């Protein structure tokens, strides 16, 4: 059985699919199109800075770009006839996930990305980051030092954290001094941390009146762990709380395999997921890979 995977980060570079919109005519108009919906709330071109024109570190800029091309090419597969037996997403990407599993409208979805980003641009600047943590969660929580939370579990020893840089920057000494493998990651904001504890209203302001209807493709969400069979469910609040509350991915990954799913697919321009679930199974399948953007 096949699931959609729909990363977040780590698969964003310079020129995300110039060539790839050169070239392919399904995902140029339909990219068109996302830019169209997308309009009324961008203050650039989408077509300039996926072609790699404008600036990768502004974060809402990116992320709507990234959903922008996840919506590209999750048609680009539709194409080719692949049917999504499941659909599921990773933090921001989970938008996507419920962009195309029929769950969400792809305006709304649009809208709420947009919003999103703009959200956490003008707050979560300069205020954490993540660090790429590969030990079990136990060991991690046995190492986690105050002012940082795990961002998310993976697997048995991934473990993304997140936290105050000031605390971040204490752990990987503490962790460097005990010479184990761990990395930083050149974002300014701890997200799913208490800092998402500080912008609640605005984001259950603008996040308001979005019509959640009944997922068309089956979704896993990982705020839940769960299934999803209900419209209006996915709410607001729903993504505040994905934003809020750690991912699960290493957990999803599990109850997913013994539902009989084994053909994954990380939809993405460069492989992050791949790893961190092909050691669980080892049936995953990459999409793209950074400056391989040809077709």
């Not at 205020?127 to 048995?156: F, H, I, K, T």
């Not at 790893?275 to 080892?282: H, V, W, Y």
């Amino acid at each position: 059985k096949v699931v959609w995977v729909f990363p977040g980060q780590g698969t964003q570079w310079a020129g995300m699919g110039r060539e790839l919109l050169a070239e392919s005519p399904v995902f140029a108009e339909r990219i068109a199109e996302c830019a169209a919906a997308l309009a009324p709330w961008i203050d650039w071109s989408l077509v300039d800075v996926l072609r790699g024109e404008g600036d990768l570190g502004r974060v809402d800029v990116l992320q709507p770009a990234c959903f922008a091309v996840m919506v590209g090419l999750a048609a680009v597969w539709e194409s080719v006839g692949v049917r999504p037996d499941a659909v599921v997403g990773h933090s921001q990407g989970e938008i996507a996930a419920a962009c195309v599993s029929g769950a969400l409208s792809l305006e709304d979805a649009a809208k709420v990305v947009a919003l999103r980003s703009q959200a956490i641009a003008a707050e979560l600047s300069g205020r954490g980051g993540m660090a790429s943590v590969a030990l079990g969660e136990d060991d991690v929580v046995s190492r986690l030092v105050d002012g940082v939370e795990v961002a998310a579990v993976n697997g048995p020893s991934s473990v993304v954290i997140a936290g105050d840089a000031h605390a971040l920057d204490a752990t990987l000494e503490i962790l460097s001094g005990e010479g184990i493998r761990v990395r930083r990651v050149a974002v300014d904001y701890a997200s799913h941390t208490r800092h998402v504890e500080d912008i609640r209203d605005t984001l259950a302001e603008t996040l308001a009146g979005i019509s959640a209807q009944a997922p068309a493709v089956p979704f896993y969400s990982t705020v839940t762990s769960e299934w999803v069979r209900d419209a209006g469910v996915l709410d607001g609040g729903y993504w505040y709380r994905n934003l809020r509350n750690q991912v699960r991915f290493g957990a999803a990954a599990t109850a997913l395999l013994e539902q009989g799913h084994t053909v994954f697919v990380e939809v993405s321009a460069h492989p992050v997921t791949v790893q961190p679930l092909s050691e669980l199974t080892g049936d995953a399948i990459g999409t793209l890979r950074r400056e391989d953007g040809g077709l």
